[PDB]
Amino acid sequence: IGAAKVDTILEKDAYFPGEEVQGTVHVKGGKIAQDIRYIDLQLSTRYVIVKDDEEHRKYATIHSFRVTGSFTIQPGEEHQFPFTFTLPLDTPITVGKVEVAVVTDLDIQGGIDKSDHDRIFVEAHPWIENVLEAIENLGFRLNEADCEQAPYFQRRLPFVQEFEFVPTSGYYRQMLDELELIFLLDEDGLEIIFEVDRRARGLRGWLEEMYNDGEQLVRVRFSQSELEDTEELEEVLEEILDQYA
Amino acid sequence: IGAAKVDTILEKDAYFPGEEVQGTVHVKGGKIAQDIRYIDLQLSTRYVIVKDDEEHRKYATIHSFRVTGSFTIQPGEEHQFPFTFTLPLDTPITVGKVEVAVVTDLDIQGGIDKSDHDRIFVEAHPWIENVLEAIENLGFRLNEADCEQAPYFQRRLPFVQEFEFVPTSGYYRQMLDELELIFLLDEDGLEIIFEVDRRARGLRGWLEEMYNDGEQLVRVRFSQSELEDTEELEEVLEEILDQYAE
Ligand code: NA
Ligand code: NA
Structure with a gap:
């Protein structure tokens, strides 16, 4: 006993x-x-x-x-x-x-x-929470976050944390059904992977088969200075998102 | 037997x-x-x-x-x-x-x-071989390459492959004793880590204590398109290196 x-x-x-x-x-x-x-x-x-x-x-x-x-x-x-x-x-x-x-x-x-x-x-790392607050200011809302299978990225861990945002403004509602972000945090900065309409497309997990048909992926690195700089952060993020129009 | x-x-x-x-x-x-x-x-x-x-x-x-x-x-x-x-x-x-x-x-x-x-x-993957050729064209020569302990980057593997180049031109000799590149290859592109004068400074491996005193590190992502157009590649690399002429 x-x-x-x-x-x-x-x-x-x-x-x-x-x-x-x-x-x-x-x-x-x-x-x-x-x-x-x-x-x-x-x-x-x-x-x-x-x-x-x-x-x-x-x-x-x-x-x-x-x-x-x-x-x-x-x-x-x-x-x-x-x-x-x-x-x-x-x-x-x-x-x-x-x-x-x-x-x-x-x-x-x-x-x-x-x-x-x-x-x-x-808790969200300060840089990550800067990105998140910036994203929500643009007219988004955080809907889901979960750890998803991601063999495609060949990371240290088998999964990545997928942040799924829903548009709260008419403009972004028109642009996409939803937004997806992956944060890859390192000592000198942060890498962000961007994707749209994953739920719409009924996509789950991150696998080779999603990028084999010539689909490609927006992957952007920010350094510390950029992440701690709030203003230009939201506007560069807006710029990145605009490529989906 | x-x-x-x-x-x-x-x-x-x-x-x-x-x-x-x-x-x-x-x-x-x-x-x-x-x-x-x-x-x-x-x-x-x-x-x-x-x-x-x-x-x-x-x-x-x-x-x-x-x-x-x-x-x-x-x-x-x-x-x-x-x-x-x-x-x-x-x-x-x-x-x-x-x-x-x-x-x-x-x-x-x-x-x-x-x-x-x-x-x-x-063998070097073609994008990496493009970067290597680009770097040597600027006036460098590949000197050493080895796998070095690298807990600082927290990658899948405990090490990274560190490429060390030696300056072959007066300009780059004036800039540095040597250049170090790390390639992190993924499916959609390639990330390059730049550092200079690691041998001069007697640094081996990549560790927290090397970047805690406010040393900083150049870290840049290139996409597939950029890596496959070789001209624009050398001039981007020339620009990145210019921050060390100081
Ligand atoms: Na306990
Ligand atoms: Na054998």
Whole structure:
């Protein structure tokens, strides 16, 4: 009926990509002593694969590291392993249906391993939120965001986070049925992938077969200066969107 | 030795990224029947990690997949497993010190596993070769190329291929001791990372601490159209480099 218990506590509720997560894994031994092989932490989320017009959600590990190595835990004994790790820059934003979880794996040799799970909210990176606010000012509204299968981009992760906006102005209603953005965040800036009418076209996921028929894709890099510069950001974004008229 | 044998044969020895590699894994049973758990192929290379000014080279897996699952092979028996896979777009170019190998892993249950090794030459993709020709035309000469540890860029692979050029003209000698380019190739175009005087500054690998003090980095995306018109390419590259004349 279980002996040793594990509990992870992060110091904050909210982080954005690039920020340092700090916390502590608390372990308390049970009635009789057990041999602990290691304590691992993982950040994970899920992403969608659509097959034959039905959704499959698949777990994916964003980051993983070892909190501690082997030690023996004796009766009732209390141990604290403090940790820190950096949130990867491709960590998805917690909005819509996207959740990001911190999973603690405490491995017990012979043994039934113990685990913990802590949701973390991942906020939009400042540059990303600048882009988003700029986009909504132009006459758009954020409708959906979800992690979608993206083998086509051959990224570190198997998925990308797809932001789907709906036009709130007559002009953009006329231009498109909806707008799609992918953010690829790096240390020096941000790359944006633009697409339109993906829902209209009944497209899900990002696959080779969508660009084989000579469809092509708008892909634009912004540097830090541009992203922190608000005004010209909205107008360059307007310029990019105008190519869809 | 009358033991179980594996031999992998590719149809070509040379490919560029995005191209399909085809071949066959040939297996021959040894004197005694064995249970084979699987046959895997691995595409791999090595990259440099510098610590305290010493080079350590570390093995890295570019791609991996299962050619076949479990079967029993009888003595002297021959099996052929044909295969195909696509060379990932971040596969490094085989030039300088870079090697790319296809490794066959035949796992035998209890058992001494068998292996094969086939080098492949990975050619510069045409857009990259356009950039390379463009850079040398401006007055550079390609000096070194290697795979370098690069956690800073957080790519799919732990390394990037770093191309180092040496200035061959008075103008560019006056500008720099050397130029460094990183190509990040994708389906719709190509991204170039520019840096100068990394060797002069004794920098190896791409790390957070190199850009924390307010060093900055030139990072520019080119599309397919731009990459395939060579003139406009050299003048764009000339313009990008002009920011270093300062
Ligand atoms: Na917890
Ligand atoms: Na071979």
